[PDB]
Amino acid sequence: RQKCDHWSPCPPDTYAYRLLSGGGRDKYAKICFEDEVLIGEKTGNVARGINIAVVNYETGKVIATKYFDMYEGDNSGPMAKFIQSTPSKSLLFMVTHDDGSSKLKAQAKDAIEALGSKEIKNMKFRSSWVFVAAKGFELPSEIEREKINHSDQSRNRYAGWPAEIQIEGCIPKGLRDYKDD
């Protein structure tokens, strides 16, 4: 058994992550980091909307976990502010549960796209979405960092919702190390 129940073991000096979007209304989104559930049913901190876990890249410390309902309220503005306020050398993990698109506004999409999102622009009602971002450094090109799955009547795993999606990988811890010569 590997950290985050990974298919294969992570190489040494790497962070293990596993992101899971919600699957309809009964299967909840989950964010696993280094074998610890940051957001999920288990920690009682997952809800409808975009669920964000923020980790200090330098220390591996969880700095913030917060969800933003995109179906009720006006949480697009607060979400954009929350993202922009994250410190440099941070990892951001974003997963949808149920819906993350209904009231998703341009300012929030611009904040997520500025982090490297190629799919937030394509968000539609009830689309499942998972995303890994680095603030103040570049993630290695080979890790799976993003996935989207749109609601489609002919493919929907649940009556009214698309299938849940997952991403997993290993992030090297030494991308910003102060090296010798």
Strand content: 25-35%
Give me the secondary-structure category. mainly beta
Counting structural domains, the number is 1
Query: Quick one: how many beta strands?
Result: 9
User: How far do the termini sit from each other?
Assistant: 39 Å
Please provide the ordered H/E string of secondary-structure elements.
Answer: EEEEEHEHEEE
**Spatial sequence of strands, sheet with the most strands:** 5-4-6-7-8
Which percent bin holds the helix content? under 10%
Biggest sheet record: 5 strands, antiparallel
Overall shape: globular
Radius of gyration: 16 Å
Q: Total helix count?
A: 2
Question: What would you note in describing this structure?
Answer:
By secondary structure, this protein is mainly β. It has one domain. The chain has 2 helices and 9 strands; from the N terminus they run βββββαβαβββ. α1 packs parallel to α2. The longest helix has 9 residues. Keywords: Apoptosis, Cytokine, Disulfide bond, Glycoprotein, Lectin, Secreted, Signal. One of its GO terms (biological process) is apoptotic process. GO terms for molecular function: carbohydrate binding; cytokine activity. This is Protein FAM3B. Induces apoptosis of alpha and beta cells in a dose- and time-dependent manner.
